Design a binder for this molecule. Sequence first.
Ligand code: NA
Ligand code: NA
Ligand code: NA
Ligand code: NA
Lengths: 204, 409
Amino acid sequence: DEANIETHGMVPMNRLTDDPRWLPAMSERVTRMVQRDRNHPSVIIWSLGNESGHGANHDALYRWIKSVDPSRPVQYEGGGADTTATDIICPMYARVDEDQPFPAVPKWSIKKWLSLPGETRPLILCEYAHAMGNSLGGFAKYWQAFRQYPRLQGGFVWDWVDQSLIKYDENGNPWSAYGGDFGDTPNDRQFCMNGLVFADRTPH
Amino acid sequence: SGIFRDVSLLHKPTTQISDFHVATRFNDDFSRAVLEAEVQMCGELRDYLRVTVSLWQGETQVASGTAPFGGEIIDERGGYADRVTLRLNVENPKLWSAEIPNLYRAVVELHTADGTLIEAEACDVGFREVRIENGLLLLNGKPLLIRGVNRHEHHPLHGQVMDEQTMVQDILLMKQNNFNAVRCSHYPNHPLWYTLCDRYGLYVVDEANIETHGMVPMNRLTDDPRWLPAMSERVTRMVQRDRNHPSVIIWSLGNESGHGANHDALYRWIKSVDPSRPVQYEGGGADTTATDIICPMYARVDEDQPFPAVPKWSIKKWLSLPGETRPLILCEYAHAMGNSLGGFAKYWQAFRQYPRLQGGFVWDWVDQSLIKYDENGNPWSAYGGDFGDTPNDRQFCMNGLVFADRTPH
Ligand code: NA
Ligand code: NA
Ligand code: NA
Ligand code: NA
């Protein structure tokens, strides 16, 4: 269960989440979610949101949840996937064997990440195996590693269904549309279609 | 068998230096060190006796301390009237490593207040700190990458007798071939080897002479209290002899002797006595309570070998097993028997990629072949069974990176 907080277009990403003036607004996004959903057995883990860097607001909220509901781990991937605001190493698109050593927020190979000095948490990818189009190449490599390494406990494929929308041609027939097809600009074209199934649920 | 190492006579005074230990501790950035030397005497105590410990950098004395005998109070019955500890401050010390084997000379003088020397003892001192922190083996605060090899004391003509020439040849070839460490497989070596490793610069794993591989199960003796005494001497006497060598960075409890409670007791004895070096031991699964470093033999890079009780996990996976945090350095890997070393690059790639994979010791340096002569007087390389020995394990003794005569494979 994840809080409705994403500030991906900010520069740097944590501009708002490190800002106390934004603490109240963020706080309601997390607290009201917990108050509403805390009795559902299916929710096993709380998430602080997505792609909003790592800011002090996050640390505050992570502690708030730990305090009010000790029954579920709290995870958050911003700021490098392994910050003080996450009980689980939960990267997005980290590779099996290959490191992607970006400055500040590297994406280590998952096998290596578990054993960096001092690291002891479990690792479950919050997003992996980007299913956009003709994709999922190398999926088996992830599964082989999840099964061999105890602390590699899986992940969440990105993602279930294509975000295509139906439009009608001059003759009224339907067709699958994406970014920019409504006159929207700027837009990100087909990047909105990354699922394992088409928008009508037919499988890819 | 036989008298295979030197025999000497040593004449000491009745009032003498009977032991001395040199320790070097540092500040946070190694810019300052304290050299502490505990000195013990045998003989008649006299108020006029003194001990001076002097530290030299080449022909320059850099520090010194002098004191009468008489240790600090240690318990309800007092202190050691027959010991003294000297503490020397050393600024900006030149640090020892296998890359730059900087050494100083410590001279320990037993003398009188008024200047007469009774006797002196001495050692080369390498200022270096060995510690494990956060899961990494650090030397002077930096994590090591062990390019090691296991080396037995073997000569095709002389058997197990070692000589300076051969030892020097081996160190030169090792260094020339980018090795930076050696494991004394599997017993303390001839004394001179330590002095050469200190001076030429190689990291050394000093191993006690205990191997009980042939017992069933392997720890039958090492788990038995009745053998604790014999075992203990093998470890304690090694430490007593080699503790002041800077090249020695890690102590090992022996080899292929399973994991017995005797190991645990001895591990703790070393940790108490010499907190300056980690203790390792591979027996019983390579990651027991008797080892500070996970130190498997022949574990593979990516492939698991899930043997009951004593599995050999892929080294990458071993590191991250639930609750594991230790560094991993293979005590033996890359079995160099005949046409071998296939897959060697796979190891290196892993070691470079994973901080906690800090290298290993190849098995092994030199082929244990022996020279024989045919009807004509022409020599040839012999192996097990070639001396009428049986049962025997044939060519199992030739696993080196070099032939017995030091020619490379
Ligand atoms: Na797993
Ligand atoms: Na997308
Ligand atoms: Na490494
Ligand atoms: Na052998």
